[PDB]
Design a protein around this ligand. Structure first.
Ligand SMILES: OC[C@@H]1[NH2+][C@@H](CO)[C@@H](O)C(O)[C@@H]1O
Ligand SMILES: OC[C@@H]1[NH2+][C@@H](CO)[C@@H](O)C(O)[C@@H]1O
Lengths: 439, 438
């Protein structure tokens, strides 16, 4: 066991009430909103296929030119209450907001840089309006924060000289200032989700990542801090050199998910996945015909897949420059919400069930040993195979939305056929099992 | 690398026309019929829940008392042409018939024992009648043969004395005599599927199992012989001490199948699974309420699973003592044929497709590189995920029964969405793909 000053801090999962809330929430929304919404993937007449929030990179735009977009930042249709209504109706329990993305433009009126909402035609504290509106709807707010900052020339990607070292030290102090500011201005914040922390410069400052975690924890009782922030003494990220998870939850499943048979290790720690609706667009991109766009069921599948293996899922939205949401995203949130209103009991506050995966869908476990079958693929055999772990029997099955009893037939030892409902629900649906453990 | 005299004889899969036919047939029926069909799992007022064809063992019936059932053997409803019609309409391309099971009662009038159909009130050569009738329908016939024989007291489970040695020698001669007799009486036989070869007496005599294979291949050109017969110089069964398959196909998947993700190794050799409709009954049992009984779709799922992993499937029937089939088996055969009539292009002459398994069902691959999606679990997403191997693309998709066109949308690198059809086909169905390598 290798010695470390800046390695993991939790022994297993946190079970304090604030962490339990973070976990039980299960479903979140991600908001990527920044100056990139304005060009929306197009620069100087050329539409770039890469992620819209990286347009400065794709189009090789210098900082001063890029940040000049602030002069155009005027989201006149923005209404925080409406955004918070959209989230509440979707059935999200929390929202993660880009306080600052790689571009460096802050959505709050920071005292530490001029590149903020205050210095735009719009002027208003967007971040603050969102925090209050979301909290008024009972929705927790989590802050995304990019460490990498393309607006501060003291940023370095690596330390290759004596001068790189000095400038980077200034950069960390600046970052510290912004972080403490965010924590003090908005003390209802429940999580900091760090990104842009992969560069060798950060990896060589493991100590700073440990300090950032602790500082924010000192400021905000019960705050969660993600693993992506963290590098240890050796510069190993997420998990330390002893293989132990740093931060409060693992945060590397991004537009992908663990395999339901081969990656059961994920059930040993808290974890949160994030996803996009198109293939890889976080910020607003004007042309979604450029890649595949996911349907609501394809998204709900991923949400349930996450919970079924002990994880949260956050579904991303890229708001328009004018402050409204594009039709496809309004369609998505409505549809997710209709389904979550019906079937959410098998998502919120649910967890890994301990059953072998079957082809029809996913199991989730409730707080009082309910086992939910979430059926995404309807068998023509009209029978849903349930193989039970050693010592577990199925006593009853119920269609969740109607209460109607479902036939359960033993087929071999440790195996049942659970009947499909007599009328096809016509959408993914839930059957609830009552189970019994021996001994 | 261990030198063997009685190990594997093939390198890889046989590819002579006889073996190609064995393989392309894909769907077989099993018939377990013998004296056990008379009591049907009940003896002296006790119904036994175990496999009816083992009732002699469950009820501890002495050989003399058990073989007396021969006096009650009179299958008045038997008609080999009706049996052949039932098979043909099920879509079975071959039938494996118990020439004799463990009980030792022979379905053909053997010269080498008194315990045959000849010495019953029915008298007739059931086996010969079946062989002709199946053959006239274009159906290949395979012979199940139990080496273990509870009717011959020279049988031994192990050889631990001079008397054991002398007796078991007589038994091997007898067995050789019956095998030669079957091969010469019925020269259209396409396969011998040996069973009851698990005892130490057989394992210790690997030479003999190699001899029986060779003897029969010489008598019946192109004949197939199952791995279950065979033990090598070291007593290792099915696969020899160098890990190589003995006989012509692997024959251990009995009432179970290989895992579609973890057991892709089975694709390297020919193999044949068998299954029962109830949990474990091969011969006729009078009470099918004692265990779970599979539905037709549950059976078709297993057939398709087998072909998807390069294997044959044989579905068992246990005819009634009277020569007719029980209502549940008639319904099964009919339902399977109906489906095979619609979707058989994706089963017959098909094989493993080399694609990663998906939740909606199975891939099979046709002879002209067609790739069939056989769908058992309809996604509410209206999309069927197809992840292609490195360097393969999907060019069209088609509802097999209606010809109707199917949208194929690329989702990421090496992944597609295939739409369901506009009308839910309403049962397991087939969508056919054209693919392209580079
Ligand atoms: O997970 C969200 C995602 N994180 C980074 C790529 O991993 C960012 O570069 C990207 O723009 C986006 O914010
Ligand atoms: O595969 C068919 C099966 N084989 C033996 C058990 O494995 C026999 O004991 C059984 O009766 C049946 O014939």
């Amino acid at each position: 066991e290798i010695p470390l000053k800046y390695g993991a801090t939790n022994e297993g999962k946190r079970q304090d009430p604030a962490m339990q809330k973070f976990r039980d929430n299960r479903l979140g929304a991600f908001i990527h909103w920044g100056l990139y919404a304005i060009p929306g993937g197009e620069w100087n007449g050329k539409v770039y296929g890469g992620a819209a929030e990286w347009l400065k990179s794709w189009a090789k735009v210098p900082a001063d030119e890029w940040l000049k977009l602030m002069d155009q930042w005027n989201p006149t249709k923005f209404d925080a209450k409406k955004w918070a209504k959209m989230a509440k109706e979707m059935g999200t329990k929390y929202v993660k907001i880009t306080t600052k993305h790689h571009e460096g433009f802050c959505l709050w009126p920071s005292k530490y840089t001029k590149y903020t909402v205050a210095n735009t035609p719009y002027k208003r504290d967007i971040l603050g309006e969102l925090v209050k509106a979301y909290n008024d709807e009972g929705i927790d707010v989590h802050f995304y924060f990019s460490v990498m900052d393309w607006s501060n020339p003291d940023y370095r990607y690596d330390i290759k000289s004596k001068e790189d070292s000095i400038a980077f030290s200034r950069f960390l102090e600046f970052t510290d200032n912004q972080l403490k500011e965010l924590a003090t201005r908005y003390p209802t914040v429940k999580d900091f989700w760090f990104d842009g922390t992969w560069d060798a410069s950060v990896k060589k400052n493991g100590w700073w990542t440990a300090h950032a975690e602790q500082m924010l924890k000192e400021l905000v009782p019960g705050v969660a801090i993600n693993s992506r922030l963290r590098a240890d003494d050796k510069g190993k990220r997420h998990f330390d050199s002893n293989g132990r998870l740093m931060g409060d939850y693992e945060s590397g499943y991004e537009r992908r998910l663990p395999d339901p048979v081969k990656d059961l290790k994920v059930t040993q720690w808290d974890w949160e996945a994030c996803m996009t609706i198109p293939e890889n667009q976080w910020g607003y991109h004007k042309d979604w015909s450029l890649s595949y766009v996911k349907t609501p069921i394809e998204v709900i599948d991923r949400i349930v897949h996450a919970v079924s293996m002990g994880g949260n899922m956050v579904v991303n939205f890229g708001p328009q420059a004018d402050g409204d949401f594009r039709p496809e995203e309004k369609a998505m949130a409505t549809a997710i919400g209709k389904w979550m209103n019906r079937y959410g009991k098998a998502v919120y506050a649910c967890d890994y069930a301990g059953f072998e995966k079957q082809d029809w869908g996913y199991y989730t476990r409730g707080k009082n040993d309910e086992v939910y079958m979430v059926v995404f693929n309807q068998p023509y055999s009209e029978r849903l195979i349930v193989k039970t772990p050693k010592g577990i029997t199925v006593e009853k099955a119920t269609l969740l939305t109607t209460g109607e009893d479902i036939t359960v037939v033993e087929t071999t030892r440790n195996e049942y056929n659970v009947s499909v409902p007599k009328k096809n629900p016509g959408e993914p649906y839930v059957i609830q099992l009552k189970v019994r453990a021996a001994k």
